[PDB]
Structure formats: structure tokens, C-alpha cells
Write a protein that binds this ligand. Structure first.
Ligand SMILES: [Ca+2]
Ligand SMILES: [Ca+2]
Ligand SMILES: [Ca+2]
Ligand SMILES: [Ca+2]
Ligand SMILES: [Ca+2]
Ligand SMILES: [Ca+2]
Ligand SMILES: [Ca+2]
Ligand SMILES: [Ca+2]
Lengths: 212, 209, 213, 210
């Protein structure tokens, strides 16, 4: 994954790549570009607006949206498909509940009818979601990265200012996760992230791949 | 129970025929307009306490407000069969445990609440069966549903008795008696072989046969 | 359009069908309400989707002012307006003037405000444009349902059940009079004979005939 | 106004937290605001009285409840310019009648009520413009929105000053002091050239000019 704007040199986003932009205006501008994304070019084949995933507000980000739960539930059912001895138990438990309640409908004085219970119905009845209420920014960053692991239509996650919140070993565990799961993410910072390699465009317009 | 040209007393299944079509139309209008024509208790009826059907097969017996009342009642019936409820409680508990393990094995921080019996009712698709209904059956169903909707003091059917054999009518008239529900049947053709208020072409109020 | 259930009766314009036996009247009503295409009632052209069918028993209760009906009526209403261009341009010029004025008000306001335009539909919707139904008689409502049947091109067959029990002999004529004018196929289904007109009849012993009554 | 996890929020007030773990911890505390570990006082603040932004450009300024309030103010404005209101009502009036005849000649029994200004604003899609915003511009708009929502007693911007030059912050602060609202700027690095509370690398609170 490749982008270019004012640099006149293409930056390469492979796994977890850090881009620090010292001058606030140029940082405000690249940020504005990222939200207006459509100038600013993302690649070979140009990225579709819909394949970009941007977060600035880590805690406000809704990770339990309707679409994301759909995939999670899809995978949970799959996982449970591969454990026939468990799926089996579940089926017999739900079957029994249905016979049981079935009887009640009969003894009920109106003309009652039922279908049955499939696993998705169970996921929905259980209130299955990602836990977020007790999240630290670190725990949440991780949760956002994993949703990205899943959202295979989302080609690039850009974090903005996310590092201003994390301790240095915290940044390393996020990187280790991104490395290990073959996803690509850009951290866009205005202040240098300590003890690692990063692109830096400095107070003047000198682009370098230094370290801190 | 009391409604009014002359005051009429509605209790169990009562029949009102109007043979002059215009005055039948006019009354049916007034029935749909209700808020001019006045309906009383033992000594004032609010619109939400009145309930009307012309389209017997189209009426949704499975509407959410009614499904609530049946579910409530179905749960009460569970509650009063303590060994059965306990069986269900532990079976849904066991499910919640199993799925909960699966949550732990899944890579993300996953959470679940629990399964209560109303959720089971909604997951099974508990409703009143209607697909196979005959007009006759649907009238029976609608009538029961009238026993439950006790904020609905009076039920009016219009032209029901044109769909129904004189024997079905009597079934229904009885069934209504066993539930002590007040329902008015408004017709335009006399209902054969029974006592009905009649308002004839020449506007004479009769209690005939 | 055509039905068989037992043989076949063409329904062209305002056509009446009296089923004199109550068992059979009820059976057929059930068939209509259970209509899908795979089941035992058959309605033609050949073709006829359930989505294309349109049945009303309860007339006062029918919602003539639904969103999907109103979209069609507004559409017609737009066209009637394009057929009188001097009125049309006056509307465009008058909404134009509106938009400029409110525009200047967006400029003078502290905040950075933006508008787009007013198009006729938006005017219809701001006008509370609907069919008046509060004061309806059954007769009046029956006209409106017929009228709405006409504008819904997707609805090929309208069916009224027991409509003639609320309607005087004069009133019936006019519905038929309207129906013919507009080339819409509506079937009136009855249990009693309709006074003084041509109908199909199924008698208590199941002979079908086409008679005045 | 008053803050503790003991700080007085008045007009434009900045609070810098130097240890990232503290910062993180407080930001989280802000997103959980109920009345638990940290507290905001006039008497307590309800969570609907609170108003936090981190994602400036993402923030929906054009929400149904905010628009409600602009429209009322726009309407108020209109009413105060009676020559204009009078022109608008004539225009809507004439339109009403033209369509009026068209309904009378329509075959169906067609009915209309009328047009009031609020409906006018709605058919226009009156909204705050944001597609072209810079972060600065958006920051002004949100500050404006805060000025309309009497209900939110406090606005908290987090990391706002990583996107803003010294001169722009200064324009934001001029605006706020002037329209007199309470907005807290929570940062993790010192904002040049102004007074701000500072939490040291623990645990000392001081109120200096940087
Ligand atoms: Ca089910
Ligand atoms: Ca969590
Ligand atoms: Ca639950
Ligand atoms: Ca049934
Ligand atoms: Ca518009
Ligand atoms: Ca009317
Ligand atoms: Ca209006
Ligand atoms: Ca703007």
C-alpha cells in the first residue's frame, strides 16, 4: 500500500508504518485530505473511498455496529460448526426447550404455533457483542485493529494521533499484532513516537526514515 | 353495552340488522368515525375501548400489543408448572455456558448477557396460526383475542354473518357466551332463525326472528 | 383478466360475481386471501403476481394515503402542472425568489450555512398534500379506492368483497360509470344478487350463468 | 465549571497532563462520565450536560437536534426583518393558491394544509457546510454549536491543539471568551504562549504561562 501527496516521494505502508509530520499546518492538511479522501492518492490500483478506514476518536468508535456483528456472528457459528460435539449438545438443548414449550402451546387455549431455534437466534438472544464499557485506550485500539483484521473489504486503517495515548511497550504490542496478522495500518502523528523507525517530515520539509 | 334511533342493549352475542342500505352505510361510517353516535357502560366509552372488524381474514391477530399479552400469559402458565420451568431454566443456562466457552476461545474480547423466556418465545416464532384459517376459525380466534384485550369493552363485526352458515353462527354465539364478552354483529340482511334487533325499510325497531 | 377455480370467467371492467351458496362464497374469499399462484385459485392475463393483486373488504379502513400511493399521486400531480406551463414557470420563479431571500439570510447569519433547492415534490410534501378521507361516506371512499387503483399501474386486478351491501343502486352505477371510462378491471364479489344488472351467478347447485337480476 | 479526578473551568481553559498514562486514564474517565471517579460541578453535571470531542472532522454538527435549534434561530432572525418575512409569506402564499387550483381541478378529492417557514428550511436542505472544512473551521462551527446548546454546560476538546497553529487557537479563545462559554482543552503537551493547568510527571498541579 502506497500514498503520495506533498512529499513528492511515495511512502510505503507495509504492516505497521509510522508517519510523523512536525509542522502543524501540514499535519492539519494531511488530516483534512484523509477525511475528504477520494490531492491525495492511494494505491497499481487506486484505493476506493470505501476501502479506507480512519479513526481519530478511539473510545467513541462503535465497534458493535450492525455490519461488524454480522461477521463476528458468522464466524462464531462457523467455529461452532467445526465442533460437532458441542453443536450437537446445543441442538439437543434447544430441541428440548422446543418440545417442552410446544406442550404448553397445546395446553394453551388459543391456536398457537412455533417454528424453531437456530444458532443465530441464540446469538441474538444472548446479547453477544464486543466488550467495551471497561476499555482503556489500549484495549480499544487493539479491538479496532482486530475488526480491521476481519473487515477484509477495509484495505487500510489510518490511526490519527493514536500514539499520543500509548506507552512505548503498548505501541510495540499493537505492532506485533499487526505484523503477525498481515494487515496494514498507518499511524499519523504530529509529535515523534519514541524509540522506533518512522517517516518524519520535519519543521522544514525534509523527509527522512530516521529513528528516535 | 348500551348504544344509540332507540337505545339498544348489547350483551353476549347481540345482533343488529339494518335493511335500508343508506342507514346501514351511515351507521358503519359512524362506527369508523367514533370518538354523534354514543356508546355506554353501566352509567362513556373511549375510542381505544372500542374494536371493529369488517375484514376478518385481513385483521392481524398477531399484532405486537396482542403478542405481548399472549407471551405474558404463556409465561404465567410456565411459572405455574414449576418443574417444567426449572427444566427450561437449566437448559438455557447450559446453552449460555456452552456459547460462553466459545466466546473465550474466540480471539476478540466477547461478552454475552443471558437468555430469558420471552427471548425464547421470540426465537421460537410463537404466534396464533392463521395461514390455514377459514373465515369461521378466524372469527373464533378474533373472539378469544377479544377476551384478552380487556381494555376493549366491545367488539363490532360488520357483515360477518354473510360468510357463515347458520350453524357456525350458533357455534360463535355460544363461544362468546362462555367468555362473557360483549360483541355486536351489524348486518344488512336479516340473520336467519334467531332473535335480532331489526330496523326495517320503514324504520321500525323490532326484536324479531 | 381471468379466473378459474372450477370454467373461466373473464373479468373486463366492472364485472360482478354472485356466489349464492355461503359455503362456496366463504371458500372463495379464503382462496383470494390465500392467493399466491401455486394454490388452487388461478388468475390470468397469462401471468399474475400476488404483488399485482389488490383486494378490499374493509373500505373505510383502507389506507389510501400510504407513502407508495402518495408517491404516485404526487407524480400525476406534477404532470398535470407541466400541462399548464405558465403556472409551472410561475412556481419555478416563485421558489427561485424564496431561495435567494433565504440564501441572503444564510449569508448574514454568523454560521457558515448552506442550502440546495426547492423542487415541486418538496412543495407537495410541505403542502400537506393528501386525499381527504375524514368525512368520507362508504360511497366516496369506494370512488377513491377505484381512483387509486387507476394510478397504480402495477395493480392489474382490484377486488371488492361485499361492496354492494353498502351501496345504493344509483351509487353502483357511478362506480361502474367511472370504472369503464378508465379501462381498469375490478371484480365485485357478492353473496346476494345485485339489483338490476348483468352478473355471473353460481347457484346453490353450482350452475354458472350470465344473467340480468 | 469545576473539575476533579481541583480545577475551575471558566471560558477557554487548558489542562495539560504530562504523563501519558495519566492522560490516557483521564481521557477514559471522561468517556465514562456518569458520576463515579471524576466529577463536574456548577451541583453535579448530567452526562447529557457533557459534550466531548476528539474527532473534530468526524463530529456530526448537523444532527437533527442541533438543526432544530438553528432553524428556530433562523426563524427568529426572519421574524425580525418583517419586510423580508412579508415577502416570503406572499411568495409561499401565491404558491399555495396556484397548487390550490390544481387540486380543485384534480379528479381525486385532494387536500392541502399550508407552508410555514420551518418547512421551507427543510425543503431547502438548510445545514452547516462541512465538506470543505479545515480542522480550524470545523472547530469554530462546533464551538458555535455549543453556543446554541444551552443544555450542554461543558465542551471538552481533546488534542485539539495538535491540529491548530498558535494564531488559530488564539482566534478560538477570542471567540469563546467573547461569547462566554465553558470549553476545556485537554492536552498531553504544553500549548505555547498561554496560561494552563499542568500535571507534572506526577503528581504536582501548577498553573503557569508557557
Ligand atoms: Ca425461529
Ligand atoms: Ca474490551
Ligand atoms: Ca438476553
Ligand atoms: Ca388457526
Ligand atoms: Ca431540496
Ligand atoms: Ca373524501
Ligand atoms: Ca404544511
Ligand atoms: Ca464550513
Amino acid at each position: 500500500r502506497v500514498n503520495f501527496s506533498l512529499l513528492e516521494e511515495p511512502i510505503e505502508i507495509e504492516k505497521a508504518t509510522f508517519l510523523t509530520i512536525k509542522d502543524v499546518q501540514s499535519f492539519a492538511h494531511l488530516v483534512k485530505l484523509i477525511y475528504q479522501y477520494d490531492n491525495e492518492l492511494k494505491l497499481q490500483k487506486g484505493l476506493k473511498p470505501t476501502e479506507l478506514f480512519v479513526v481519530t476518536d478511539i473510545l467513541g468508535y462503535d465497534v458493535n455496529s450492525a455490519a461488524t456483528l454480522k461477521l463476528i456472528y458468522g464466524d462464531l457459528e462457523a467455529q461452532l460448526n467445526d465442533k460437532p460435539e458441542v453443536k450437537s449438545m446445543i441442538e439437543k438443548l434447544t430441541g428440548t426447550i422446543s418440545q417442552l414449550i410446544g406442550y404448553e402451546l397445546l395446553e394453551h387455549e388459543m391456536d398457537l404455533e412455533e417454528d424453531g431455534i437456530i444458532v443465530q437466534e441464540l446469538f441474538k438472544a444472548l446479547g453477544i457483542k464486543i466488550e467495551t464499557t471497561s476499555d482503556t485506550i489500549f484495549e480499544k485500539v487493539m479491538e479496532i485493529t482486530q475488526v480491521h483484521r476481519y473487515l477484509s473489504k477495509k484495505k487500510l486503517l489510518i490511526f490519527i494521533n493514536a500514539c499520543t495515548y500509548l506507552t512505548e511497550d503498548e505501541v510495540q504490542q499493537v505492532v506485533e499484532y499487526i505484523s503477525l496478522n498481515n494487515v496494514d495500518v498507518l499511524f499519523l502523528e504530529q509529535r515523534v513516537v519514541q524509540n522506533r523507525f518512522q517517516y518524519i517530515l520535519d519543521e522544514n520539509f525534509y523527509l527522512s526514515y530516521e529513528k528516535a
